[PDB]
Symmetry: D2
C-alpha cells in the first residue's frame, strides 16, 4: 500500500519516522506523500490535525493513524514496530468519525475535525443565530464554537460543552462569554444538532470576523453568512486494537 | 378511533376536556381509557408526564397529544376545536422521541421521558461509574442525572447540560455538585451516549439511593447496580402542524 | 493553659492524641474538655467541624488547631511533637475567620464555619429571596447554599462559587440547579454579601425545609423565614508558621 | 461648583446636556471641563466609563453622576431637572467604589472601574499565576479577567464570576476557557482577593499580550509581568436618593 508519515519535526519524532520507513522497506509497501492510502502522524494532536488538513481532498481514500511522542493518537512510540507489521499485513478494521462543514459567504468552504469558531475583529461580537431558517437568538458576547463529536474533548470542553461519542453524527454549539441581562438573551446552554440541520450566523453590524477552523485562524471581511452543518465527508482511522473513546476520555482527563 | 383525555383537574382543564369529548361525539370516535390509540393531555408538562406513565405498557399503540392551559404541549386551549376535527379526520403524521431505560438491581425496570436521577438517602453520595464494562470514574457529590433528548430542556438544562435535538437517539449524563480536588476527580462535563452504550452505577459504601424517574421518586434499598441505556421503546406524538423543536426551545427560553 | 484533643477515633488518631497528651504532661498545661483555651482536632475537616460545634459557646475563649491524619488542618501527624512544644511555650499568634449566622423563624439560631443550605422536604423548592428587605428574586430549583469565606473551598466550590480570602468579612450565596425560562428567573450568579447585609428566604408554598449547617442536617417544619448574615462571632486559630490560604488552596486543588 | 457634562453624542443626549447647562445657568454653578468637581455623564455605561477615564487624574476631587438615555446610571432623562436643582443646592452624600490597579512591566500603570483582561496576540495563552509571590498555577486557555466589585455585573458575570457588593474592597479573577486535563490544571473557580494582595502574571513563552482596561484594548510587547491589586484610589459618586446595588442588580437582570 502507498503510505506517508508526517512528523512533529523534533528529534524523537524524526528518528521514529525514519525507523518506521526502514521497517516498511521490508514489506511492499511504498512511500508516497502525493496519494497515500495510509497517513501516519507522529507527534501530538496538532501534528495529527495538520496531517488531516494536508490530505482533506483525499479523505475517502485514506486511513489515518496517530503516534503520540493524544485523542487522535493511539500508539506510544515503543509500539511503532508492532504497528509497521500489523499495518503491512493489513490486519486492521476502519472506524469513521464525523466532520463539520463551514461555509463562509460574502463562498468559501472548510472542513474541521475539531471545531470552527467565530469571534469579532475587535469589535463587539453580535450575530443572529438562524437554525433551519428559523431565527433562534441574537448572540452578544466573545464568540461561538461549533464542534464535531471528537472535537468535544477539545475547545468545546473548556467552554462547558458536553462530550459526545463520535459515532453520533452531530455538531455542538457552545457560547463564549455571552451577555445576558433583562435586554439581551441567549440560550446559555450548549446546543447539539443532528445531521442535515443548518446553523447560520448573520452579522448585525459589523461584517468582519476572525474565523478559526481547527488550528487555522483567518480574518474574513465583508461576511454575509457563516453556515454550519455536519459534513457528508468522514475521516477514517486504521486500528488494530480496542481503544474505546470513553477509555480514551478517562485516560486523558481522570488518571 | 379509541381515545381518552387526562386533565390537570382544575376548572379550565376539566371544562376543556368535556368540550372536546362533546366535539368527539360528532365523529366516531369513541372514548376508551383502557386501550386508547390517542391520548390527549390537558394541563402542563407534568400532566403530560403522568399521561405517558399511565400508558407506558401501550406506547407502540398510542399517539400522544398535549394541550397547555409546554414542551410536550403544543396546542393552546383556543385551538381545541380545530384539534378535534383534524384528529377525527386522521389528518396527522407521527413523530417518535427516544426514552431512557433505567434498571435497578438488588431487578426493577423503568421508562423515563424526561430523566432519571440518583441521590443518596443522606448520606454522602459515592458511586463508581462504569461505561460499557469499563470503569470510568468514582463520582462523589450530590447525585447524577440521566436525560433523554426531550428531557434536555428540563432538569438536565439546570445542571449545565446540552440541549439535544430529539431525533438523536442518545442519553446525556450530568453531575450534581461533584467534589473535585487533588484526591477526588470526575469528568466535570456532561456525557452524551449513543444507543447500545450502557452506563452502570455501582455503590461504594452505602447501597441506599433516592432514585427518580421523571416525577416519581423512591428510595431503593440494598442496591447493587443502577443501569442506564437508550430504550428500544419510543413515545409517538400526533401532529398536525410544523412546530420545530428549536422553535419550541426559542419560545420557552428566549421570547 | 487548659486544652483538650478530639480524635477521628481511628487507631492512628487515638494514638497520636495519647502521645500529645503525654508530651503535654511535661509542661503545665492541663487537660480540660469543659473549658479549654486550646482545642486540638486530629483527623480530617469533619473532625475539625465537630470540634468547632462542640465549643461554639466558647469561641471567644478558644484557639483551635487541626492535625490531618485539610483546610482546617495544618499539621501533619509527624509534626505533632513540635506542635506540643511550640503550643506549650505559647509561641503563637492568632488568626480569625468569619462565620455565618443562620436564623430560622416559625426562633432558632445556628453558626456555620463552612455553610448553611436549604432544600425542600421533597417537594419542589420555591422561596422568595429578600436582601435588606428588598425583594430580589423568586428562586425555583433544588436549593441554596450560603457560605463563609473558608467554606468557599467546600460545597460552595462544587456549586460554581468563587473562592474568597477569609480576611474578607462576607458570605456567598450559590444556586443549586435553578430553573430559568421565559417565565421563571434567577440571578444565576453567586452573590457575595458584606457584613450587615441580611439575606432572607421566605416560603411561597410549602413551609417545610431540609436545612443544613455544616454537617448537621434537619428538617424544619412550619418555617416562616430563614435569615442569613455574617456573624459577629469569629473562630480563632492558633499558629505557629506561615501557611497562606492561597498556598492551602494550591496544595488541595492544583498539586 | 465647577461641573462638566459628557454626552453619548446622539440627539437625545446632546439636547439633554444643553438643557441641564441652561438649568445650571440659573445657579452658580459654572461649567469647567478642565477642573470640575461634578462630572455628569449622559448616555450609557460606556459613556460613563469614558467620563471616568477622562478625569482619572482627578478622582479625589470629583463626584460622578450618570444619566441613562445602566449600573453607573442612576437617573432617567425625565429626572434631569430635579437633578440640576438637587445638585445646585448641594443636597447629596458621596459613595465610593474600589478600583483595580494594573501594572505592566517590560512600567505602565492603569486604573479600571470595570476590569482588566489579558489574552494572547494569537498565540496560545500561557501564563504563570503568582499570588503574593507564591506560584499558584500555570494558566492555559483564552485569557484572564480581573474585576472590581462594580465590574462584577459586567464581563466577570459572563465568565461565571460572582457579583460582589462594591463596599467590599476586593478584586475578582475569572478564567476564560481554561484547558484542564491530566496534564494541565487550573483552579477552575473565580478567585476573590482582599486589598493588599498582589496577583502577578508572568509569561511562559511568548511575551506579547492583548491587555484591556475597561474599553481600552492594546497589544503590549515584551511583557515581563502584569500585576493586579486593589487600587488605593476610589471613584466617588454623588447621590441623592437610595438606589441600592442589589436593587440595581435586580432591575438589570431579573425584571
Ligand atoms: N480532539 C481533542 N481532544 C482533546 N484535546 C485535544 C484535541 N485536539 C487537540 N487537543 C489538545 O488541545 C491542547 C491545546 O491545543 P494545541 O495548542 O495542541 O493546539 P493545536 O495547534 O494542536 O491545535 C489547536 C486545538 O486546540 C483547541 N483549542 C484552542 N484553544 C483552546 C482552549 N482555550 N481550550 C481548549 N482547547 C483549545 C483548538 O480547537 C484546536 O482543537 C493540546 O494539548 C492538544 O493535545
Ligand atoms: N421536557 C421538558 N422541558 C422543559 N421543561 C420541562 C420539561 N418537562 C417538564 N418541564 C418543566 O419543568 C418545570 C418544573 O417541573 P414540575 O414542577 O412541572 O414538575 P413536574 O411534576 O411536571 O415534573 C417534574 C419535572 O421537572 C424536572 N425537574 C425537577 N427538578 C428540577 C429542577 N430543579 N430544575 C429543572 N427541572 C427540574 C424533573 O426532571 C421532571 O422533568 C415545569 O415548569 C415544567 O413545565
Ligand atoms: N472548608 C473546606 N474546604 C475544602 N474542603 C472541605 C472543607 N470542609 C470540608 N471539606 C472537605 O469536604 C469533603 C466532603 O465532606 P465530608 O464528607 O468531609 O464532610 P464532613 O462530614 O466533614 O463535613 C461536610 C462538609 O462537606 C461539605 N459538602 C457536602 N456536600 C458536598 C458536596 N456535594 N460537594 C462539596 N462539598 C460538600 C459540607 O458543606 C460540609 O462542608 C471532605 O473531603 C472534606 O475534606
Ligand atoms: N459595571 C457594569 N455592569 C453591568 N453591565 C455593564 C457594566 N459596564 C458596562 N456594562 C454593559 O456591558 C454591555 C456591553 O458593553 P459595551 O459594549 O457597553 O461596552 P462599553 O464600550 O461601554 O464598555 C465595555 C464594557 O463591556 C464589558 N464587556 C466586554 N465584553 C463583554 C462580554 N463579552 N460580556 C460581558 N461584558 C463584556 C467590558 O468589560 C467593559 O466593561 C453594555 O450593554 C453595558 O451597559
Amino acid at each position: 500500500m502507498k503510505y506517508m508519515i508526517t512528523s512533529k519535526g523534533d528529534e524523537k519524532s524524526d528518528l521514529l519516522r525514519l525507523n518506521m520507513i526502514a521497517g516498511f522497506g521490508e514489506y511492499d509497501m511504498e512511500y508516497d506523500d502525493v496519494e497515500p492510502e495510509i497517513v501516519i502522524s507522529i507527534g501530538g494532536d496538532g501534528t495529527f490535525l495538520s496531517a488531516f488538513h494536508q490530505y482533506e481532498e483525499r479523505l475517502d481514500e485514506i486511513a489515518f493513524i496517530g503516534i503520540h511522542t493524544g485523542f487522535y493518537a493511539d500508539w506510544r512510540p515503543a509500539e511503532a514496530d508492532k504497528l509497521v507489521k500489523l499495518l503491512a499485513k493489513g490486519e486492521y478494521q476502519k472506524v469513521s468519525y464525523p466532520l463539520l462543514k463551514t461555509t463562509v459567504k460574502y463562498e468559501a468552504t472548510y472542513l474541521a475535525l475539531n471545531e470552527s469558531t467565530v469571534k469579532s475583529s475587535g469589535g463587539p461580537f453580535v450575530v443572529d443565530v438562524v437554525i433551519n431558517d428559523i431565527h433562534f437568538e441574537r448572540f452578544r458576547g466573545d464568540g461561538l464554537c461549533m464542534s464535531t463529536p471528537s472535537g468535544t474533548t477539545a475547545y468545546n470542553k473548556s467552554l462547558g460543552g458536553a462530550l459526545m461519542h463520535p459515532s453520533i453524527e452531530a455538531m455542538q454549539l457552545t457560547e463564549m462569554a455571552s451577555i445576558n441581562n433583562r435586554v439581551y438573551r441567549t440560550i446559555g446552554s450548549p446546543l447539539v444538532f443532528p445531521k442535515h440541520h443548518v446553523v447560520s450566523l448573520q452579522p448585525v453590524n459589523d461584517k468582519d470576523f476572525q474565523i478559526s477552523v481547527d488550528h487555522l485562524s483567518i480574518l474574513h471581511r465583508d461576511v454575509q453568512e457563516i453556515r454550519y452543518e455536519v459534513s457528508a465527508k468522514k475521516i477514517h482511522f486504521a486500528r488494530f486494537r480496542s481503544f474505546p473513546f470513553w477509555r480514551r476520555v478517562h485516560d486523558s482527563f481522570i488518571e
